[PDB]
């Protein structure tokens, strides 16, 4: 059975804080078949390499994808000093990972564009003393604690959101704000890959 990467090629890719995660097990994969369809602008890895990630056997392969403007490549480089790693998307510290930035060629019209790019620029708890804010950051490999209060696309740059927390939850509020970047002529995306060499047999292998 060949791992089927077709879902990336169909529909509107979510924004970075709503990244779509696909988990592959017990299948053979052809990574170059996927990547050859895109114009790859950046391809960086941690604890693995582009050559190795395409050629090893894993207990599982996890593929994340989202809309992401190439002009925010540096917002990735700043890592937890900037809003993407703080509030939107932060890959595993525990397993090898890669992060790919790619442009959608004009031929792939089945990938439809969102109205704009959006990301979360603030996620904080406003405490019951109605005074101090405590930032609530994303944990590696997880979704933002503010995904439930930010819309799938931010309507206007700087829009602000809040949700009252119950007394049992400690009171106060969960608060967030969104930023936007204008859509590009061709859609630009990020692909995140995490692999696991697990107890479970390494039955995610390259197609030969």
């Amino acid at each position, epitope marked *: 059975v060949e791992c089927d990467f*077709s879902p990336l090629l*169909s529909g509107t890719p979510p924004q970075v804080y709503n990244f779509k995660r696909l988990v592959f097990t017990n299948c053979n994969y052809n990574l170059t078949k996927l990547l050859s369809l895109f114009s790859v602008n950046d391809f960086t890895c941690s604890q693995i390499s582009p050559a190795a990630i395409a050629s090893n056997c894993y207990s599982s392969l996890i593929l994340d994808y989202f809309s992401y403007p190439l002009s925010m490549k540096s917002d990735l480089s700043v890592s937890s000093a900037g809003p993407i790693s703080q509030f939107n998307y932060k890959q595993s510290f525990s397993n090898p990972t890669c992060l790919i930035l790619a442009t959608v060629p*004009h031929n*792939l*019209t*089945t990938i*439809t564009k969102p109205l704009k790019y959006s990301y979360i620029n603030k996620c904080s708890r406003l405490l019951s003393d109605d005074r101090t804010e405590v930032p609530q950051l994303v944990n590696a490999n997880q979704y933002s604690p503010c995904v439930s209060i930010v819309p799938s696309t931010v309507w206007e740059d700087g829009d602000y959101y809040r949700k009252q927390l119950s007394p049992l939850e400690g009171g106060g509020w969960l608060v967030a704000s969104g930023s936007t970047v204008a859509m590009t002529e061709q859609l630009q995306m990020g692909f995140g890959i995490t692999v696991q060499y697990g107890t479970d047999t390494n039955s995610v292998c390259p197609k030969l």
Partner: nanobody
Amino acid sequence: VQLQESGGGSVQAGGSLTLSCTFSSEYTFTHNAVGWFRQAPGKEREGVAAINGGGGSTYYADSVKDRFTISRDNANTVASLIMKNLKPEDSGIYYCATDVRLIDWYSGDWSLARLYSTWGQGTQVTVSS
């Protein structure tokens, strides 16, 4: 059903026909693709043309290039096949198909019938010398 071919008929060699693949009112191929195939007695089913939602990618069999044209409406609910300069060996039952495995479709396998999960009932094309 879901896929319906129309527009087939009988025609003299050198004539033309336009086939239509109409999706049920609730369905679209906006995020997928449509292939046109044909079946002749004693031959395997043959892909002749295909197009994706949005029309960014179009493919043609060598046997029909420069004679056939595949197109879509803006809404990706009708895929049309304009066939010109028809030959007797173009006679067949013509099928449209959708719900394709997209990655393989984009990667050179557009004409592989097994990749398509949803098939119309077909329309008759009869070309007479």
